[PDB]
CSV table of C-alpha atoms in Angstrom, one decimal:
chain,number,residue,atom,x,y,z
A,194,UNK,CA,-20.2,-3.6,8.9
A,195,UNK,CA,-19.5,-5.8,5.5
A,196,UNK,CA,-18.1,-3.4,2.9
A,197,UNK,CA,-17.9,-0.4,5.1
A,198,UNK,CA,-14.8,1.7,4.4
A,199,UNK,CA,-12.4,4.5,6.4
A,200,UNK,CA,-9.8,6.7,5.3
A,201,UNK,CA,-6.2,7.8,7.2
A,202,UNK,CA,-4.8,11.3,8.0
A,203,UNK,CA,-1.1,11.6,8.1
A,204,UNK,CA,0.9,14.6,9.0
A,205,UNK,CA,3.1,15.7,6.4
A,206,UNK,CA,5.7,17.7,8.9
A,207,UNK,CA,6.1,14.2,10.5
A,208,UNK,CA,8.0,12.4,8.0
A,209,UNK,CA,8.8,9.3,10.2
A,210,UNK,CA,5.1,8.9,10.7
A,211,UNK,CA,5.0,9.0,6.5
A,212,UNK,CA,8.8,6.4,6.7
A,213,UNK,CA,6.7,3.5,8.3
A,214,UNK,CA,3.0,4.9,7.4
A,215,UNK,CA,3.6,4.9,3.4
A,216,UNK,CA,4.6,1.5,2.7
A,217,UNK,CA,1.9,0.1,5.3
A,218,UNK,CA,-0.8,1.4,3.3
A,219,UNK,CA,0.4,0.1,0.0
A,220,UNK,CA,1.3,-3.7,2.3
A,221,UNK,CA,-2.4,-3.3,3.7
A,222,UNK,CA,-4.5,-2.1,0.7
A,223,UNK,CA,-2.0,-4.9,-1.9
A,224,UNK,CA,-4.1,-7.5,0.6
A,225,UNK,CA,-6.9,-5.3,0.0
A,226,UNK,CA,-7.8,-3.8,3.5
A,227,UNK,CA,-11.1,-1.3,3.1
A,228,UNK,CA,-9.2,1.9,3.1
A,229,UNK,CA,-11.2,4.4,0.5
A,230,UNK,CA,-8.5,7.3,0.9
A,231,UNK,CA,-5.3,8.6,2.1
A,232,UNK,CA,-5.7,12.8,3.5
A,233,UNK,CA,-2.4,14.2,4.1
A,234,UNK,CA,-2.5,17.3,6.7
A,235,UNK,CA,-0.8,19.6,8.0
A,236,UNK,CA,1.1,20.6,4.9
A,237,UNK,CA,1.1,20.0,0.7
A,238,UNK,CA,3.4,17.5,-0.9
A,239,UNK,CA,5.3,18.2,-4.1
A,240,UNK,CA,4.2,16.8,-7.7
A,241,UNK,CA,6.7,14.2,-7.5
A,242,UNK,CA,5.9,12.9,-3.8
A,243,UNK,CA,1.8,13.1,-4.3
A,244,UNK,CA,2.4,10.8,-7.6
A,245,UNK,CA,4.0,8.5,-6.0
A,246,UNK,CA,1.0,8.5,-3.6
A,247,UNK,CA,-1.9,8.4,-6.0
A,248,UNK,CA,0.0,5.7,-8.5
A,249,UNK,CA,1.1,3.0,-6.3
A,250,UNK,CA,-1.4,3.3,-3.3
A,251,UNK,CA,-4.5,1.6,-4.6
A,252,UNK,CA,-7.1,4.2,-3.3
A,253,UNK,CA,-9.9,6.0,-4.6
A,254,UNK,CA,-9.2,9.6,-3.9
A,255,UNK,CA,-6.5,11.8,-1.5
A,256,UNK,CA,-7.1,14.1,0.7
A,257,UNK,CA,-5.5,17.5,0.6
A,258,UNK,CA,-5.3,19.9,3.6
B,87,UNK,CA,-18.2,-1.5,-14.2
B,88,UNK,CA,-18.1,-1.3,-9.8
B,89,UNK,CA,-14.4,-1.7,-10.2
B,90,UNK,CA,-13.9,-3.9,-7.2
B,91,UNK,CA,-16.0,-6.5,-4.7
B,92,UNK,CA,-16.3,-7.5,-1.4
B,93,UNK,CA,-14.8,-11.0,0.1
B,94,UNK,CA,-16.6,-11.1,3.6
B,95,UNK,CA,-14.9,-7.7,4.8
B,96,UNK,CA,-11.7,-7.0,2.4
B,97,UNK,CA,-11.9,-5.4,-1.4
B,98,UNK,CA,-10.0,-8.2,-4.2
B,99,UNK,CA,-10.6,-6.6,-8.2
B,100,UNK,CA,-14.2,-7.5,-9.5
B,101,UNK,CA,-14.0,-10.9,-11.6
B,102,UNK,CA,-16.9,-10.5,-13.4
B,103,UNK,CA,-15.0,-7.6,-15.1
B,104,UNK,CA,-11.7,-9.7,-15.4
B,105,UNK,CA,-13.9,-12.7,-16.9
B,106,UNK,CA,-15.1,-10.8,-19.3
B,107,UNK,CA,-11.9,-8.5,-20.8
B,108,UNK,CA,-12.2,-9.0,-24.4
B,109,UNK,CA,-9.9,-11.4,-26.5
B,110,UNK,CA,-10.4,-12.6,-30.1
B,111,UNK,CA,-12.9,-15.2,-29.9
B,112,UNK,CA,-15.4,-14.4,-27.4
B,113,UNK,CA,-18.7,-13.5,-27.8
B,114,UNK,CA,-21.9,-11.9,-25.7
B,115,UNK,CA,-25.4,-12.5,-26.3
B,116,UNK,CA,-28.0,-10.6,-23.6
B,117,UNK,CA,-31.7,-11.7,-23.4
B,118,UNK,CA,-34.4,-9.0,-21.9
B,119,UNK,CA,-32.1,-6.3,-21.2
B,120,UNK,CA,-35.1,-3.8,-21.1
B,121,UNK,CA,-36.2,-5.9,-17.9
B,122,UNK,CA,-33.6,-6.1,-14.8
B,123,UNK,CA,-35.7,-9.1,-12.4
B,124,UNK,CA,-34.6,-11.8,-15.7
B,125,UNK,CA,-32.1,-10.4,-17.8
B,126,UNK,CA,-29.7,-13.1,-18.9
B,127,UNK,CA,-26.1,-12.7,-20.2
B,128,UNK,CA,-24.0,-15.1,-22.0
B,129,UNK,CA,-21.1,-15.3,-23.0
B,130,UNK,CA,-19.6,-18.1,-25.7
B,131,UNK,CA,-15.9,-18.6,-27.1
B,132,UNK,CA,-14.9,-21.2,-29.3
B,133,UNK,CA,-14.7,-24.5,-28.1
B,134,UNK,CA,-12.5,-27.5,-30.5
B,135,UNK,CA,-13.5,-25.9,-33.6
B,136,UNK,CA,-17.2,-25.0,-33.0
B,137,UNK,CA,-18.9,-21.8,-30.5
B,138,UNK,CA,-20.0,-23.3,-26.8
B,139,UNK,CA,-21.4,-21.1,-23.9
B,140,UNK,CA,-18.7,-20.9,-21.3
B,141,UNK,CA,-20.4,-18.1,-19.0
B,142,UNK,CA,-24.3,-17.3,-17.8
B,143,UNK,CA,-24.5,-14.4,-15.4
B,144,UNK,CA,-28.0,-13.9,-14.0
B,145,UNK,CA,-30.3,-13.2,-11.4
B,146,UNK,CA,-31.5,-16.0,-9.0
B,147,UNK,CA,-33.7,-15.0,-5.7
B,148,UNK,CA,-33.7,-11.1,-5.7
B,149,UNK,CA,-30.4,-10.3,-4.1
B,150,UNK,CA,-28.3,-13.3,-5.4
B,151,UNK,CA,-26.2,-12.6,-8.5
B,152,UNK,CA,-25.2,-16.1,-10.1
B,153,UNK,CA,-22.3,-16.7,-12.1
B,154,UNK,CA,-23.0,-19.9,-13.6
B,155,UNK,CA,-19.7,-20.8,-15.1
B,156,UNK,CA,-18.6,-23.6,-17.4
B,157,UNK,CA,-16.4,-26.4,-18.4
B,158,UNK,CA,-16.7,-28.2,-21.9
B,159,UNK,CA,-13.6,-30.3,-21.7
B,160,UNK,CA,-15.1,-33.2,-19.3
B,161,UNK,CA,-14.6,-36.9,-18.6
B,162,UNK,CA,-18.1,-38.0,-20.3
B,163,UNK,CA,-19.3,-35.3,-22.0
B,164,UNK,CA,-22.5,-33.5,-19.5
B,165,UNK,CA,-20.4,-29.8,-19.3
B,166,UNK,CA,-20.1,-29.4,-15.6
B,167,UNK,CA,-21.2,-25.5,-14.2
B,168,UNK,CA,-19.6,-23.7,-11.3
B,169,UNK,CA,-22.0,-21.9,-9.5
B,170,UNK,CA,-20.0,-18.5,-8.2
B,171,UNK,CA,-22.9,-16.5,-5.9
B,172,UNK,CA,-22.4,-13.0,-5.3
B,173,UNK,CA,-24.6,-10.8,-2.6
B,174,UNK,CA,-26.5,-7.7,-4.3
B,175,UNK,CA,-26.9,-5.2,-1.5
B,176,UNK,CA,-28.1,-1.6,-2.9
B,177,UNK,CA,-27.9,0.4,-0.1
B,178,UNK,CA,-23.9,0.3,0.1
B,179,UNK,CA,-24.3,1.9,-3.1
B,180,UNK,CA,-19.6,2.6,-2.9
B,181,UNK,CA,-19.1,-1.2,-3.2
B,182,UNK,CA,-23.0,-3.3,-3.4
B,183,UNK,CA,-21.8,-6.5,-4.6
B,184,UNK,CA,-20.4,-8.6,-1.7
B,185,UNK,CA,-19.2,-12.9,-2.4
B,186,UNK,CA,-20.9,-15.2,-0.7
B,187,UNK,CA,-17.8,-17.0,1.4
B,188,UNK,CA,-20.4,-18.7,3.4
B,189,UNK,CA,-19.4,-22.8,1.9
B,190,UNK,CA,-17.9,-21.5,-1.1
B,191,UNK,CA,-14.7,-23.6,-1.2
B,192,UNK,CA,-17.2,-26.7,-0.9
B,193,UNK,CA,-19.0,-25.2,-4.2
B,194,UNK,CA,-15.3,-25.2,-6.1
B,195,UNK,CA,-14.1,-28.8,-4.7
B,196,UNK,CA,-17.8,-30.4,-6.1
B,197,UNK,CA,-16.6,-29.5,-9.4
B,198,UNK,CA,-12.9,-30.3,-9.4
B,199,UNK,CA,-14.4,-33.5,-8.1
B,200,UNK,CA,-16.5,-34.1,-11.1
B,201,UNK,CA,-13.7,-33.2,-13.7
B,202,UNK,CA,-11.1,-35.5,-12.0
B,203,UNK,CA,-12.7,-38.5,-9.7
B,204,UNK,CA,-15.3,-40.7,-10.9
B,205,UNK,CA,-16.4,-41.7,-7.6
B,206,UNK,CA,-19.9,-40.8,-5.8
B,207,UNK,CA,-18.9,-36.8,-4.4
B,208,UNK,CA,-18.2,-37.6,-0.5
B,209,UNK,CA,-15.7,-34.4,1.5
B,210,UNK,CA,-16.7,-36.5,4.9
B,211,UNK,CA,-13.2,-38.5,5.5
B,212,UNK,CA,-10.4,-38.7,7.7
B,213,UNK,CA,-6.9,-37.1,5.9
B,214,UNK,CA,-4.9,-39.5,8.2
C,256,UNK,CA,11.9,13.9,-1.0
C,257,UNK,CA,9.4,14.1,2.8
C,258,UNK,CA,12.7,16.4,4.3
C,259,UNK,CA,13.1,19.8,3.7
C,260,UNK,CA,10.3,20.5,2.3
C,261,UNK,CA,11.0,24.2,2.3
C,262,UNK,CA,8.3,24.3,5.9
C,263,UNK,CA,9.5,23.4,9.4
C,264,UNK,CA,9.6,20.0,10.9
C,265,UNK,CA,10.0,18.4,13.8
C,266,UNK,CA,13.5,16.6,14.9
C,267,UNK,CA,13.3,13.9,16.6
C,268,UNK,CA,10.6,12.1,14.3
C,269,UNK,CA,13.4,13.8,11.6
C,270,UNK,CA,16.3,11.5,13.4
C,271,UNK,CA,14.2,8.2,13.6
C,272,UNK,CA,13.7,8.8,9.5
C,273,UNK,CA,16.7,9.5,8.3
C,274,UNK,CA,18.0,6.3,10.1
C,275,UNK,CA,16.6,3.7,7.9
C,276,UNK,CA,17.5,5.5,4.5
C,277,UNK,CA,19.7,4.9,1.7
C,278,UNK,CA,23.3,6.8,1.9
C,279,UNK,CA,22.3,8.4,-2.1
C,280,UNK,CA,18.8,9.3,-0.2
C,281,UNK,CA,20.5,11.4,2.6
C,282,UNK,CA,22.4,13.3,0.2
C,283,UNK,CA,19.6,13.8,-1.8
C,284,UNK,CA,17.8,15.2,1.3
C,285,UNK,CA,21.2,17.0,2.3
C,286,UNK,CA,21.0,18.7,-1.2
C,287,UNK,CA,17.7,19.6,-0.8
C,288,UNK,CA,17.8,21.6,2.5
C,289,UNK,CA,21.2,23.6,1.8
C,290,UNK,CA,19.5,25.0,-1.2
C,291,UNK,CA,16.5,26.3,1.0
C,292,UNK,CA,18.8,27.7,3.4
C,293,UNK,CA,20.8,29.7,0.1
C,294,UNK,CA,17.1,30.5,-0.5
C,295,UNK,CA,16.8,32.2,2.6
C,296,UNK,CA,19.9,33.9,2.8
C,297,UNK,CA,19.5,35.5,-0.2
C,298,UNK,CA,15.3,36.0,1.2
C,299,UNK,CA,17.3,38.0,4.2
C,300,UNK,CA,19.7,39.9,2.1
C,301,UNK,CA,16.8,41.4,0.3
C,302,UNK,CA,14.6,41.7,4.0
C,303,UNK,CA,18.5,42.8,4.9
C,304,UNK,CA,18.4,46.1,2.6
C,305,UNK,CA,14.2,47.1,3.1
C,306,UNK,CA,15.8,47.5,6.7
C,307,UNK,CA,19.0,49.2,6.1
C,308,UNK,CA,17.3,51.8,3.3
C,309,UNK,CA,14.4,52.8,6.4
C,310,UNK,CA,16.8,52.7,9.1
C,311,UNK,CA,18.4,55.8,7.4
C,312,UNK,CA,15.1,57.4,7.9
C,313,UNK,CA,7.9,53.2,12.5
C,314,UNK,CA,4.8,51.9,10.4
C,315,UNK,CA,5.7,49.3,7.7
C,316,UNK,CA,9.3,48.8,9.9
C,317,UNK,CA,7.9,46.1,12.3
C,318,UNK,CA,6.3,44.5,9.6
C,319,UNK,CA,10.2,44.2,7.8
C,320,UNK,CA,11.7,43.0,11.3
C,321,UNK,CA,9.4,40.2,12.1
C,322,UNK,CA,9.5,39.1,8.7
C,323,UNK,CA,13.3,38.5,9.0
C,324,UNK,CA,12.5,37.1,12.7
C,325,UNK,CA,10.0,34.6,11.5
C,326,UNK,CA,12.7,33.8,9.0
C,327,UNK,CA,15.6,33.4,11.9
C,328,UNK,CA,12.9,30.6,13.3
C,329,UNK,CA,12.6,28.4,9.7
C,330,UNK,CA,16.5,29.0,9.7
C,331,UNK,CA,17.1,27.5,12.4
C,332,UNK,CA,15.2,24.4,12.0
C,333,UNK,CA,17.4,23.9,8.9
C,334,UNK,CA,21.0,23.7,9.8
C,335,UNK,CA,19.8,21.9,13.2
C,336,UNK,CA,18.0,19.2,10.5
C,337,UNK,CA,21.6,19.4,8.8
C,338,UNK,CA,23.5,18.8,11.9
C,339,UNK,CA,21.1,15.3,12.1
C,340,UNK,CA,22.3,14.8,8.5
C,341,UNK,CA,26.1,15.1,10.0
C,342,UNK,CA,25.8,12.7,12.9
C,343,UNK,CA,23.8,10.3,11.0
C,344,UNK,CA,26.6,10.4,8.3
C,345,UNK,CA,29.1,10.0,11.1
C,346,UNK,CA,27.1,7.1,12.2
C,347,UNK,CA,28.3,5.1,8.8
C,348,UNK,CA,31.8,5.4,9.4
C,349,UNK,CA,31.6,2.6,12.3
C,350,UNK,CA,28.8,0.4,11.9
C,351,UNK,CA,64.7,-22.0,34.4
C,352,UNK,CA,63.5,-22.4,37.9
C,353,UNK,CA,65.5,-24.8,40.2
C,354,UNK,CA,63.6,-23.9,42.9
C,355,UNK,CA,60.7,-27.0,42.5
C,356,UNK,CA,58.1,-24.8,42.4
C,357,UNK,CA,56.3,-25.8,39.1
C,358,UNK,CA,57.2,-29.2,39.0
C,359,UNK,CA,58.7,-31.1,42.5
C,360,UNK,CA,61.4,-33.3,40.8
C,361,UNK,CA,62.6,-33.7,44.2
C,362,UNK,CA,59.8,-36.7,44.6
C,363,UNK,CA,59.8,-39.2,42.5
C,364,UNK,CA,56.0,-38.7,41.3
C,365,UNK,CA,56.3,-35.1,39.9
C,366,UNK,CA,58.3,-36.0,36.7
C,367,UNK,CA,55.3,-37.7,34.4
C,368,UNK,CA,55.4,-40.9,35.9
């Protein structure tokens, strides 16, 4: 429906999935695709990686597994 | 404050909000504020020298937010108003307000029209 | 940096990655996983001793000697992400006859005419 939104789960042990999975989120949510938030399972991301993550992907809240 | 909008399925930043950043100048003036159905807010900035309304953002019909927005600086004088409309749905309470895309190009074109040809307001011709 | 992140991951989504990277990324990564293999090894020498100090001497033995298994298995998946890291790397560094044979000067025609 209008203005309905989803999120994405990536898998943090599959980095190729996060090589090309990454920068499509940023491509698709700069054009302003409804995606509310990013989780990323399987795993925790360091300070430096998840900043990068909340800074420059324009999402509302990250989920943590 | 809803920090972005709805075009027709995708989320671009909430104008209203980008409109209104403050500057030097500008100033705000709200009428029944106690009272949601005909609350009226307006905003002026100066204008050559003296203080003209440039924005009026209100409620038409009960579910269409109107952004009545204005030009001073015209061929003959009459200030010429775009009408941006805006859908007010509460029950997608994450992102409520939704543009109306439905002929809004048309609404944008009417006033260019006005501020540039002098000519009766006809779209209905062949480009070739 | 997404590799070696100190947990297990899978290779071959590993060798897709590290292919469309930047030469100062890969040794960045390559940095990154030879210090959590040092921080194993020196994990192991200390696993290496609890086992060698008891072994003088079985509860609280098993306990040691699948801890320093489990720790053979996160091993492993390091210097076989390392050896990606080498052939990757290795990947970069290529990118008078009188006899009228030829000509039948015995005819007129065979000259240039």
């Amino acid at each position: 429906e209008k203005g309905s939104t989803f999120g994405i789960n990536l898998i943090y042990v599959n980095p190729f999935m996060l090589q090309w999975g990454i920068p499509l989120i940023k491509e698709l949510r700069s054009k302003g695709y409804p995606i509310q938030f990013l989780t990323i399972g399987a795993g925790v991301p360091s300070l430096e990686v998840a900043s990068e993550y909340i800074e420059t992907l324009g999402l509302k809240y990250l989920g943590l597994k | 404050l809803c920090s972005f909008i709805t075009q027709d399925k995708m989320f671009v930043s909430n104008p209203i909000r980008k409109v209104f950043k403050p500057s030097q100048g500008m100033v705000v003036e709200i009428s029944n504020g106690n009272t949601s159905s005909k609350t009226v807010v307006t905003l002026s900035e100066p204008v050559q020298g003296e203080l003209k309304p440039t924005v009026i953002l209100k409620l038409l019909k009960e579910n269409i937010i109107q952004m009545e927005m204005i030009e001073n600086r015209t061929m003959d004088g009459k200030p010429v108003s775009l009408p941006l409309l805006y859908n007010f749905n509460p029950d997608n309470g994450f992102a409520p307000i939704s543009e109306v895309m439905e002929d809004r190009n048309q609404r944008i074109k009417e006033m260019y029209w006005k501020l540039w040809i002098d000519e009766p307001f006809n779209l209905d011709f062949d480009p070739r | 940096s997404a590799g070696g992140i100190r947990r297990p991951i899978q290779i071959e989504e590993f060798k897709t990655a590290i292919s469309g990277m930047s030469d100062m990324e890969l040794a960045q990564i390559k940095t990154e996983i030879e210090n959590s293999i040092n921080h194993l090894q020196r994990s192991n020498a200390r696993l290496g001793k609890y086992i060698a100090k008891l072994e003088g001497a079985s509860g609280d033995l098993a306990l040691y000697k699948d801890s320093v298994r489990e720790n053979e298995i996160v091993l492993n998946n390091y210097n076989e992400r390392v050896d990606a890291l080498e052939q990757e790397t290795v990947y970069r560094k290529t990118g008078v006859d009188m006899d009228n044979s030829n000509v039948d000067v015995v005819t007129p025609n065979s000259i240039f005419i």
